[PDB]
Write a protein that binds this ligand. Sequence first.
Ligand SMILES: O=C(c1ccc(Cl)cc1)N1CCSCC1
Ligand SMILES: O=C(c1ccc(Cl)cc1)N1CCSCC1
Ligand SMILES: [Cl-]
Ligand SMILES: [Cl-]
Ligand SMILES: [Cl-]
Lengths: 695, 697
Amino acid sequence: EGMWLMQQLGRKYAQMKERGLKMKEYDLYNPNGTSLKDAVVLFDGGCTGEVVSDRGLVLTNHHCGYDMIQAHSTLEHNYLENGFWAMREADELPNKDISVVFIDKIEDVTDYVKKELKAIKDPNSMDYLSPKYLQKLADKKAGKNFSAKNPGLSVEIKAFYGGNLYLMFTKKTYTDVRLVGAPPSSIGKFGADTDNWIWPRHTGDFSIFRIYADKNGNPAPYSEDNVPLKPKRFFNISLGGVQENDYAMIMGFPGTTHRYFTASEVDEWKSIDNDIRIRMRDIRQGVMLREMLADPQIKIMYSAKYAASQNAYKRAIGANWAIKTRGLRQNKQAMQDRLIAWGAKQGTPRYEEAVHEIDATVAKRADLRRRYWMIEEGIIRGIEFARSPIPTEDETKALQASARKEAIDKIRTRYSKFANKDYSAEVDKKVAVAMLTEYLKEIPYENLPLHLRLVKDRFAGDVQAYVDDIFARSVFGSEAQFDAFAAVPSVEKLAEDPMVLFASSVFDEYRKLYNELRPYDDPILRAQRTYIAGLLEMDGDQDQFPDANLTLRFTYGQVKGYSPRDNVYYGHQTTLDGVMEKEDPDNWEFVVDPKLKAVYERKDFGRYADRSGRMPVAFCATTHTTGGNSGSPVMNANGELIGLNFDRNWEGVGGDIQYLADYQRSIIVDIRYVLLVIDKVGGCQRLLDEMNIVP
Amino acid sequence: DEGMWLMQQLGRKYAQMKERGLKMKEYDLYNPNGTSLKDAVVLFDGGCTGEVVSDRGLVLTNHHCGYDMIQAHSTLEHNYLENGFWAMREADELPNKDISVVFIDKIEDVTDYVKKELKAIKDPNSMDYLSPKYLQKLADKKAGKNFSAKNPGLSVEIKAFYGGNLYLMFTKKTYTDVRLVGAPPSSIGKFGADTDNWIWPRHTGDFSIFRIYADKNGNPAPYSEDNVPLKPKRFFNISLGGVQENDYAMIMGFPGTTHRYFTASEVDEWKSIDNDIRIRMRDIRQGVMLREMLADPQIKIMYSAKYAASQNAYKRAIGANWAIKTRGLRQNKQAMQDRLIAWGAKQGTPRYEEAVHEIDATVAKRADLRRRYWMIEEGIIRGIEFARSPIPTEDETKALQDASARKEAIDKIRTRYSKFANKDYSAEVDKKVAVAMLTEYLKEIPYENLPLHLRLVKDRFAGDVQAYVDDIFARSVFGSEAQFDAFAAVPSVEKLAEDPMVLFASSVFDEYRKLYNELRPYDDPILRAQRTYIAGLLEMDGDQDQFPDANLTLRFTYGQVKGYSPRDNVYYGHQTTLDGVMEKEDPDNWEFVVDPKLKAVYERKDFGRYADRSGRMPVAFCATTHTTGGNSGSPVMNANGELIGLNFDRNWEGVGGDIQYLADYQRSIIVDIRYVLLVIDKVGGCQRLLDEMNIVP
Ligand SMILES: O=C(c1ccc(Cl)cc1)N1CCSCC1
Ligand SMILES: O=C(c1ccc(Cl)cc1)N1CCSCC1
Ligand SMILES: [Cl-]
Ligand SMILES: [Cl-]
Ligand SMILES: [Cl-]
């Protein structure tokens, strides 16, 4: 049920041991010594990774190393579709803008931060959650020139439990992280978008990198003279596999959770956030699909935009399923009613007052929040011509010196980025007509972006005519229309351009709503500090985990399947047989790598198949994970690497608010399948040889 | 392989059934010379199975079996299809016109008799051995002079089995006054609707209740207000003990057809011609229909049923092709025939190998013709609605060419036009379907093999399929109502003789009939060789683990209540519950709406004695019994012969089971009798039906 602070390992150790943990507490996390924690990294600012060799080899997900594989792929060597396997360390490819962060030390600085905060002057100050303020405190505690005295290191203070606990992290950052190996996209992304959030899963979601450093193992930017890092700790790889009910644990960097939402916040998340995103994306995706299915060239141009919209659409469907079926609202109501009753008993009304302040703030911002999600889902992300070019104050104060041609070249560059190879004005007009029809029926005339008032005023309610007119008369309606403008540009033409005015109007309203809604966050945040303090004072800091905030956490559970619906059971482990059953040569998502298909036919599984001769692929566990846990190491009761976390099932996406023991699972690629792909698909024996593989 | 066994085969199967869990005495289940459980089984309305469940002739069958009778009695004032129907007294039960229930009174092996009569052969190639006319002449000869009058209600029938190697005579008792007694609302009776057709897990309460009526002596009689409920010689006891995983289960029913003795060449033909053409053509048709239904809510209303009707055999063909590809159906037929050929060679009898060769050569010879037939049938005859547009008859054409019979002909043509262009017909949707169907058809079928009118696509329209279809509607008398009325006002034979829609419809039906006539002769050599082939198989491995193909006759099948794994890491258990109905509820999707009375029963847990030991409410179960179409409504029995359920469907993974039974995938989908009695009790409130049944603890 939790994403626990490293500091909470002492308090949790006895329960973990009763659940199967065999390793010593300080071998997993030592606050003043080397531990397994030292082999975990924050990979490229949003994924987790792990050191698996004495020469700095790092494993993470394929979707985590995707951009680096794509940036090194060309028409001649397409590493994205064929994979990549450096046969020597010197062949490993450097990556620009990459990083790996080690969590060198973690300290509780609560009394320090709470004493510094006492120098208040304003009870409603938000400095207690300010990265700028907390950084000034972190620097004060570390010292004037800490990063110069300790190079490669940096400090950071973060708030936890709504501002009731503060931790300082001493981080070590390496920026020379090189691509070593990756399976083909057919393995690394087998399910592709059809199996996203799905269990059973058959995806070999892994990629291999290597941390490089200077001669002393100190952080250094890319240089041809950099040497692989010899880390202070790396994971041993287990080949013993997994069995149902086996103890499993994960360390990683979960991004966000909302475990202390009030019942009113659950209703708002359902009725505004999720219902609007669901309704608007269903309209958008419906029109896109119709057009993609009717024209194979539209399918090529819109496949990625369609897939990108489906991802949070599916998450919202999964989250609304939990609100409707798992009693999320009710359990938050029971949590707050229990605190209110205990507060009344102790003669302290501040907890009930705090819950009331949250409810009243939610109720007060309802119409504004509805208008914001409606314009964001409906227009800002729903309609492509909302992000069409808007002339800057510098560009209009140039068109009306010969810098007029420099303004036109800047506007032209933006126009070509909007109307790119994947942009269809006809498809966009069809999407806009459906999106705006829904938007105009939900947002009243007095709340509309100024230009959308023309639908009723000038176009007699004809949405099609309004959209047709934007493209017919706009300088960004077609290439020829832009060129005619570029030849004779006047500021009066841009000031009255229907597409410019639409884009300006919708962005003006989007920004006005954001600015009007931002002040409502602070009373909720301040009341949550009091609310979570009461919850901790009442039921204790053990069962109630602090919300995720991109900091290192541990979670434990077991390798276990679940029943998704009546009379259906999904086991704990998928096999290579499941990849073969899913093969569809004429569906790019489910194509099987020929070398992998041959390995399966010949049963060339070596030391990686299970005791029954079946080749495992993936497994699931009752660990509590979220976004940010993407390439997390999964450990045995002995702390050996058994897999890599890569996803979670849609039935558990509501788990960011309320953990669902009977449904929520972490989706993990089996380490035996990782080694089988490195060995029989990549033929990269040197990577197997540098790992410490235990029988 | 698992079996749809003849009643005669119960004796030789009894010991295996007992070892599998059967507890009842052999002759209590079937006795040729006395009353047995077999006497409580009926053929319901010529294509379903039913069962007598009371001493007053109450009959249980599926909701989809009694569907037409529930619909015929439904009005805007009393919609029994939507709300259900529950007669609170016997006099309130509704009569049905054109209904029947058939009891199998006696079954007799008449093989020696038929085989001796056949010896009077005039042509060794004669198909009389499979002729219903010939076999009826033999049945009438054996039964006696004027048997129908001497025994009212009874009739005799001889059928061939094992490709003409075994013959059985059936003495049938037919009742035609069968009244509607009860039915759940469509929300229970067809819960899955078309989404869950061929699907396990399943949550559908697929049952309906009827009653057999007869004269004062229990003898068959047509509907009369003086008819009294039948006091039958046998009825099923209802069990409330439920089912558990691995429990023995058995079914009696009337499976229609199987192809257990296909050669490997016939499996390849079924895959590459029958199934691939049906799959490809229906996917094109359904694809266009769906786009139009999704774009216009009025097109969705008009085409929903046509779309659903096409998807049914489309899904079956997808399931059958999955078995051919993954379960080794072709290979196992090849191994079956190779084993017989090897044994025949050792015996010095080459006639079995000669028979398999004759089947292979016939399959290879008819390939192009069969391809052209399935292509036109799936592509045009079924695929395009204007193929079934009006064609003026030879007498209608003559009637138009100096009498009052001109207005008579126009009224007949108008009636047919109004049936073609009905409230559900869209000419625009049909033109879109025809353009896609004909594009595929013109790609597969060469110019010299095209129906005459389709040659105009290349000749007159420069290959433009859209122009050809547009022209059919623009210039045709049946292209619109106004075009028909203009014709009806000034009708000339010369206008009909050159009508593009008439010529298209005529051409495609001419080609469809020419192909049928050219292909029909190929059936006979296959049939004759199958008689020799199945005789060899029976002589070699015995009439013991090789069941005779289904032929709409009474069979029994046995197995166990067991789930299965459909794919890697997925298990489907043996039993669904009322929670599964609730998880599937969608108020804005007509298929998954939940009856309010049923939803309340679930919330209050008002399950009475019908819930399982854990307090869960059972809905349906699946079993390793071997069933096919015709088994809808079949009684499912306990080891004690008590009714535990009604068969109503089978999973898509087992549709290949008509050729090769699939032990690890094929399951019969059965509605639990505890759920049937729960709906009668807590949803219908029809206590009198519960009271007349013999319910065992
Ligand atoms: O099948 C579903 C789904 C889930 C719940 C509900 Cl209520 C409806 C549909 N998906 C696809 C996988 S991702 C989540 C949405
Ligand atoms: O989903 C399928 C299906 C089955 C097998 C294959 Cl190869 C492809 C799709 N259905 C379910 C309804 S009944 C049969 C068709
Ligand atoms: Cl290190
Ligand atoms: Cl012979
Ligand atoms: Cl099988």
